[PDB]
């Protein structure tokens, strides 16, 4: 049997699979290479891996995991997860292959939803980013833009971005910004454009200029976009996990949900962005809850 | 110096890593007294599973040295005192003195062991403390669980049982409760309550356990339940207030009652965790530090 089916081979699923593999549990690990950070050149902030390529990380971790004879890997798109009348969960893939598991750990991460700006996806990962703690250093002291539609995000995002560069233009892309926020930014020599963006310029995802609807053109080298995130799958929904009084689907600090034998690790947990090292840690944590839960019922 | 980081374990390393990328001025201290230095390998840290403790520490420093705003000092930190300014004064063993706006403590934890002769020679080699870290390498072996306190024995037994079923519990002269004792009898796990006289086996590799009465048993290794303590009194020199969780921490980012004082690594939960978990608590701590600075500087 499968003790735990781990859906997702990012830092979360991988580190969860590593600990569970070392704990002699039968693990089915699933990945389909739709991880959101594959659109970026490098990755930083993961100690001892500061500067590694996102596909190299994936590969090194995937191989450590496969040292352990009980962890089995499937490069397959999981499309359905269903609690049977037998208690087991049935994992089904794109190629109609079926897997039965006593436990499921969802570590599928999330996906970016972008501001209604044309051509934005080409720039995302080369010259436009979403986390300054991750990609600020490489952009430091350059003429930057912040694209932020929702107001309450803009102010915080700006103050943070200002750590890496004091040369900022905020662009709301067609949304109002309180006189409050406008005056505070402008008091820092930071201008604000409330016009909708019509165009980005610069070959191959590398920003040069931004053209607004009015016709105005400024000269930015890159910067930061605030996306909204969604889950690419509807697995939490399929399995009936309840949303909690804290806005999340998780019930303790170990990835346990409202549904017995369903667990979460990584960005699927908080439904907001973190980092590789945090996700890995949450994988380690879920592994501890899963092994603990199995131990309790079997001993 | 925006933040003095005390401790270059995975916590301090990852904290300094993020702060060096946040263009903050960092002083990072470490006196090479990490508890895990007695073990020969580390596991469970993704991409780094199997690495020597030293190699891990080396690679990290080399990585944090990449960022000009961060400078590393291999001194022992003796005193951390506040000042009339609101800053913090940091004094080392060689009496050198350091000033810094904010303080991050990531000095990990130390272990106290049960009163058994020479027990420290086997720890790291054939005696261990966490089944998640070292169970794999010990699977299906003749193991002993040394646990003086009732309240910890059962948990440690159920857990270690994942890796081997050939177990012996040794309470080292301490009483085990009737209820717990019957729970173990059912799973065929023998319990010796007699005092342990000597541990035998050369070069830190356990062979035999001899009890007070004369009984010698064959065992190849196993687990001890240590009490944990803080090596320094820094938290206490800085007057952080103990929350009702049993922790000097007010949130998930290492913040405390004492403004400008942050915590990461094993010093946070004041209980064992892992390389990868501490490391991420460094990250979280960094974020919090930069977020509180940005708030005040804007
Ligand atoms: C442009 C960019 C740059 C970044 N840079 C950094 C950085 O420098 N440092 C840093 O620490 N973080 C960075 N991040 C964020 C980092 O990538 C994430 O925080 C981290 O990957 C989250 O870990 P995770 O394991 O939760 O999710 P992921 O790593 O996203 O893993 C999710 C996995 O689930 C799999 N999956 C999803 N659905 C299915 C399905 N139906 N079937 C099978 N498999 C499925 C995907 O293949 C993916 O592998 C960056 C992100 C972006 C977008
Ligand atoms: C035998 C053993 C085996 C283990 N195996 C594993 C394993 O395989 N995988 C795993 O994930 N975890 C393992 N661990 C646990 C792991 O080592 C710890 O969980 C982790 O290192 C603690 O993180 P930390 O950074 O908070 O503390 P540490 O890494 O211990 O960092 C504390 C640092 O603070 C420094 N320090 C403290 N006070 C001062 C001072 N006054 N001045 C200067 N420097 C100071 C010390 O030099 C030390 O380097 C093991 C632990 C032990 C004991
Ligand atoms: Mg990058």
SS3 string, A27-96, reads EEEEECCCCHHHHCCCECCCCCCCCECHHHHHHHHHHHHCCCCCEEEEECCEEEEEECCCCCEEEEECCC
Alpha-carbon distance values, B44 to A19, A221, A288, B135, B275 (Å): 6, 40, 11, 11, 8
CB atoms within 10 A of CB B228: 16
Spatial distance between the Cα atoms of A277 and A291, rounded to a whole number of angstroms: 21
Residue B159's SS3 state is helix
Residue B13's SS3 state is helix
Of B4, B7, B59, which is best to mutate to test ligand 2, by the most ligand atoms within 8 angstroms of its C-beta?
B7
CATH 3.50.50.60 occupies which residues in chain B?
1-113+226-298, 114-225
CATH 3.50.50.60 occupies which residues in chain A?
1-114+227-299, 115-226
Report whether CATH 3.50.50.60 matches the domain B114-225. yes
CATH of domain B1-113+226-298: 3.50.50.60
Sole residue written with tokens 């870290």: B133
CATH of domain A115-226: 3.50.50.60
Give me B88's structure tokens.
């913090």
How close is the nearest chain B Cα to the Cα of A104, in Å?
20
Give the strand order in the sheet containing B97-100: B77-82, B88-92, B97-100
Superfamily of domain A1-114+227-299: FAD/NAD(P)-binding domain (3.50.50.60)
Q: Is B140 left (phi over 0), alpha (psi -120 to 50) or beta?
A: left
Q: How far apart are the first and last CA of chain B?
A: 18
**What is the experimental resolution, given in Å to one decimal place?**
2.4
Find the helix packing angle between B275-297 and A151-161, rounded to 10°: 100
How close is the nearest chain B Cα to the Cα of A215, in Å?
32
Residue B84's SS3 state is coil
CB B201 within 8 A of CB B186: no
Please, which residues have CB within 8 angstroms of residue B296's CB and are 6 or more apart in sequence?
none
Minimum-distance CB partner of A15 among B23, B276, B286: B276
Residues of A in contact with B281 (CB under 8 A): 281
Minimum-distance CB partner of B46 among A18, A24, A164: A18
Find the helix packing angle between B275-297 and B10-20, rounded to 10°: 40
Nearest residue on chain A to B11, judged by CA atoms?
A47
Interchain pair A57, B49: CB under 8 A: no
Interchain pair A159, B276: CB under 8 A: no
């Amino acid at each position: 049997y499968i003790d735990c089916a781990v859906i997702g081979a990012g830092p979360a699923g991988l580190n969860a699979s590593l600990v569970l593999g070392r704990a002699r549990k039968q693990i089915a690990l699933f990945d389909n290479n739709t991880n959101r950070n594959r659109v970026t050149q490098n990755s930083h902030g993961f100690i001892t891996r500061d500067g590694i390529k996102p596909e190299e990380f994936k590969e090194i971790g995937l191989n450590e995991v496969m040292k352990y004879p009980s962890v089995h890997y499937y490069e397959k798109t999981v499309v359905m997860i269903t609690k049977q009348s037998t208690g087991l969960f049935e994992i089904v893939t794109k190629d109609h292959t079926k897997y039965l598991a006593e436990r499921v750990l969802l570590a599928t991460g999330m996906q970016e939803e972008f501001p209604s700006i044309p051509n934005v996806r080409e720039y995302y990962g080369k010259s436009l980013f979403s986390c300054p703690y991750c990609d600020g250093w490489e952009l430091k002291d350059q003429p930057l833009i912040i694209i932020s539609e929702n107001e309450d995000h803009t102010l915080h995002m700006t103050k943070l971005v200002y750590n890496w560069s004091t040369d900022l233009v905020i662009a709301t892309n067609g949304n109002e910004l309180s006189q409050t926020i406008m005056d505070e930014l402008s008091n820092k020599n930071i201008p604000v454009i409330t016009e909708s963006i019509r165009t980005l310029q610069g070959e191959g995802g590398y920003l040069k200029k931004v053209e607004f609807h009015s016709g105005l053109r400024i000269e930015r080298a890159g910067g930061f976009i605030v996306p909204t995130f969604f889950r690419p799958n509807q697995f939490i929904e399929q399995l009936g996990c309840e949303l909690q009084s804290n806005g999340t689907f998780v019930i303790d600090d170990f990835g346990r949900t409202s549904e017995k034998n369903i667990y979460l690790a990584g960005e699927t947990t908080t439904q907001g962005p973190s980092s590789l090292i945090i996700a890995a840690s949450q994988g380690n944590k879920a592994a501890i809850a899963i092994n603990s839960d199995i131990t309790d019922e079997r001993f």
